[PDB]
Amino acid sequence: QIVVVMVPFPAQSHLNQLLHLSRLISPYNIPIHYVSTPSHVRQAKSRLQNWNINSATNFHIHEYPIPSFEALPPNPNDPTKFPTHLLPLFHASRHLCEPVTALLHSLAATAHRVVVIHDVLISSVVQEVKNIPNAEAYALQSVSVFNHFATIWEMMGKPSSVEDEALNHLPSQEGCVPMEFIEILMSQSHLANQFATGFIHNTSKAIEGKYVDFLDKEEFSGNIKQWALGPFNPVSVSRHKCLNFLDKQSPRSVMYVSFGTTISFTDEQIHELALGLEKSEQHFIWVLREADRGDIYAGTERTELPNGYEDRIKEKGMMVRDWVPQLEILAHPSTGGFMSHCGWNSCLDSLTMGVPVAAWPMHSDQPRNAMLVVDVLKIGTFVNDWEKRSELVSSAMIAKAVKKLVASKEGAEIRKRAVEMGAAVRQSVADGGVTRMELDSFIAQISRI
Numbered sequence: 001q002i003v004v005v006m007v008p009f010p011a012q013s014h015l016n017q018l019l020h021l022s023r024l025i026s027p028y029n030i031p032i033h034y035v036s037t038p039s040h041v042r043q044a045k046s047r048l049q050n051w052n053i054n055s056a057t058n059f060h061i062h063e064y065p066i067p068s069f070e071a072l073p074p075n076p077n078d079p080t081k082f083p084t085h086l087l088p089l090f091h092a093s094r095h096l097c098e099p100v101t102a103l104l105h106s107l108a109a110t111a112h113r114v115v116v117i118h119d120v121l122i123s124s125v126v127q128e129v130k131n132i133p134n135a136e137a138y139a140l141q142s143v144s145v146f147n148h149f150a151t152i153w154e155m156m157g158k159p160s161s162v163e164d165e166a167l168n169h170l171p172s173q174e175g176c177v178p179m180e181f182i183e184i185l186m187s188q189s190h191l192a193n194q195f196a197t198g199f200i201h202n203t204s205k206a207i208e209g210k211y212v213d214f215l216d217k218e219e220f221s222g223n224i225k226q227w228a229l230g231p232f233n234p235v236s237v238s239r240h241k242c243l244n245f246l247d248k249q250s251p252r253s254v255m256y257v258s259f260g261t262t263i264s265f266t267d268e269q270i271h272e273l274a275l276g277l278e279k280s281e282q283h284f285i286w287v288l289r290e291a292d293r294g295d296i297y298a299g300t301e302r303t304e305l306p307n308g309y310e311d312r313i314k315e316k317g318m319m320v321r322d323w324v325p326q327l328e329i330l331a332h333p334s335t336g337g338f339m340s341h342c343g344w345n346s347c348l349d350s351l352t353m354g355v356p357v358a359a360w361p362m363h364s365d366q367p368r369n370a371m372l373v374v375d376v377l378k379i380g381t382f383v384n385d386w387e388k389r390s391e392l393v394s395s396a397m398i399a400k401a402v403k404k405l406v407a408s409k410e411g412a413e414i415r416k417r418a419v420e421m422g423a424a425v426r427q428s429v430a431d432g433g434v435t436r437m438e439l440d441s442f443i444a445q446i447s448r449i
C-alpha cells in the first residue's frame with residue numbers, strides 16, 4: 001500500500017489548499033491522512049467549499065492538540081502589512097513534530113511507502129522522514145511559481161541563462177515581510193531542501209508553464225523534481241445572500257471586493273475604500289472582515305462605516321462581514337471583476353473563473369503574484385502604485401480602477417483575455433490537459449514499486 005500524509009501550515013489558505021489537493025488525489029484510491037490541530041481542523045472543515053468531505057472515501061483526519069499560544073488580534077498599523085500577529089502560532093505549530101513523528105513511524109510499519117505532502121513552512125514537523133527508509137516528502141510551495149522562481153533567480157545572482165523580460169522589472173520585496181518571517185522561511189526552506197524528494201506547486205502550466213520549466217532546470221532546483229498540480233480549487237461549481245444579490249444584477253456588472261484572511265486595514269483606509277466604491281457608481285459586493293487570528297475561535301473581531309453610507313449605497317452595494325462562497329461568487333455570470341490583495345489562492349480562483357483582477361497587493365508574494373496577473377498575463381489592472389505602497393490609497397484611485405474593469409472599453413478587452421485564460425485553466429485539469437498529465441505522472445511517481 002501507498003499512503004499519503006497531508007500536513008498543512010495552520011492558516012486558512014494553507015489548510016484549504018491541501019483539502020482540495022486531497023480532493024484531487026482521492027479518485028486514485030490512495031489513502032490520505034490529513035493532520036492539524038483541533039481548532040484548525042474545525043476551521044478547515046467549517047470553511048471548506050465545493051467538496052463534500054463527508055463523502056470523501058479513503059480520507060482520515062487526525063487532530064493533534066498543541067500547547068497554548070497567544071491569539072493576538074491583527075494590528076492594522078504594522079508597517080509591513082504582514083500578519084505578524086500569527087508569530088505565536090508559527091512557534092506553537094512546531095510542536096506538531098511529536099505526534100506527526102509518531103504517526104509516520106506508525107504508518108511506515110504497514111505501508112510500502114508513506115508519502116508526506118507538507119507546507120514548506122512546516123518542514124520541521126515532518127523531518128523524521130529522512131530517518132524512515134520507506135517514507136518520502138514532497139514540499140508544497142504555496143504561491144505563484146513566478147514569485148518563487150523570481151526569488152530563487154535573484155538569490156542566484158540573476159543568471160542570464162533564462163531569458164524573460166519580466167524578470168528585469170520585478171517589484172521590490174523590501175518591507176514585504178518582517179525579519180522574523182524571513183528567518184523562519186529560510187530555515188524551513190533549507191530544511192525542506194535537505195530531505196524533499198520533490199516540490200509540488202499549486203499552479204497550472206497553462207498559467208505559468210514558462211516559469212515552471214525554468215524552475216525545474218537543474219541550475220535552479222538541482223535533482224528535486226517540480227510538479228505543477230494546480231489549480232487546487234475546483235474548475236466548476238455546482239441560496240447564499242451574496243448569490244441572491246448577484247441574481248438580481250446584469251451580466252458582468254458586479255465588482256467583488258475581498259482581501260483574503262491576512263490583510264488588516266486601518267479605519268482610514270476602510271473609509272477611503274467605502275467612498276471609492278460609491279464613487280465608482282458600479283454594483284459591488286464588499287467582504288469587509290478583519291484578518292484571521294491564529295485561532296479564529298478566540299476573542300472578538302474588530303469597523304464603523306461612514307455616516308449615512310450604508311443608506312446611500314443600498315441598491316448598488318452589498319457589504320458582508322463574514323465568510324462568503326468566494327469561488328461560487330466568481331463563477332456567477334453577474335461578476336465583472338475582482339478587487340483582490342492577490343493572495344495566490346484568490347488569484348487562482350479568479351483566473352480559473354475568467355474574472356479580471358483589480359490588483360491591490362499588500363505583503364509577502366502578493367506584488368509578484370499581481371505583476372504576473374496584470375503585467376505578464378494582461379488580465380488585470382493595478383489599484384495602488386507599488387512604489388507608493390506606504391501611502392493611503394485614495395477613494396479616487398479605487399473608483400478609477402473599478403470603473404475601468406467593469407464599465408470601460410479597455411475593461412472589456414481585459415475581460416476578454418481573462419475569459420480566454422479561464423478556458424485554458426479549466427481545460428488543463430480535464431482529460432488530456434496539462435495539469436491532468438502532471439497529476440497522472442505524480443501519482444505514478446509516488447506509487448512506484
Ligand SMILES: O=c1ccn([C@@H]2O[C@H](COP(=O)(O)OP(=O)(O)O)[C@@H](O)[C@H]2O)c(=O)[nH]1
Pocket residue numbers: 012013014016049258259260261262263287322323324325326327342343344345346347349
Ligand atoms: O470570504 C472568503 C474569503 C476567502 N475565501 C477563500 O480563502 C482563500 C484565500 O486565500 P488567498 O491566497 O487569497 O489569501 P490569504 O487568506 O492567505 O491572504 C481562498 O481559498 C478563497 O477562495 C473564501 O472562501 N471566502
